[PDB]
């Protein structure tokens, strides 16, 4: 949101902007209100997240590689 690298930089190098928000919340408060999908798609979000966590502890098969 604010960078200087005071004197010797000569290059953008601003990864700091994307680390805060800058676009994740703009392409969210851009449109599509709902008041419904939030609880729907985010209950959908971590539903699949726990199963990737499940097979994280479930890839102990052989498969030969």
């Amino acid at each position: 949101i604010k960078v200087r690298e005071n004197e010797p930089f000569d290059v953008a190098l601003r990864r700091f902007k994307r680390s805060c928000e800058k676009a994740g919340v703009l392409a969210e408060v851009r449109r599509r209100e709902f008041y419904e999908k939030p609880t729907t798609e985010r209950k959908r979000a971590k539903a699949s997240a726990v199963k990737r966590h499940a097979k994280k502890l479930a890839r102990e098969n052989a498969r030969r590689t």
Partner: protein, 65 residues
């Protein structure tokens, strides 16, 4: 990973800006619990601490002031 008042119990104060600014990014956002490794109970008091101190102009709402 790290811990706080979870072991050495203490009440999170809002006048204490020293320990409070560790939980605030350069933008002026409240960091999530999924990073600082704090407990849920102490987190809520900490969230209330930020909102109280922000009202008393001790912490910025954003860095564009």
């Amino acid at each position: 990973f790290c811990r706080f008042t979870a072991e050495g119990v203490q009440e999170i104060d809002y006048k204490d800006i020293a320990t409070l600014k560790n939980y605030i990014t350069e933008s002026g956002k409240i960091v999530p619990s999924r990073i600082t490794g704090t407990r849920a109970k102490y987190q809520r008091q900490l969230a209330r601490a930020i909102k109280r101190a922000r009202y008393l102009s001790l912490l910025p709402y954003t860095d564009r002031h």
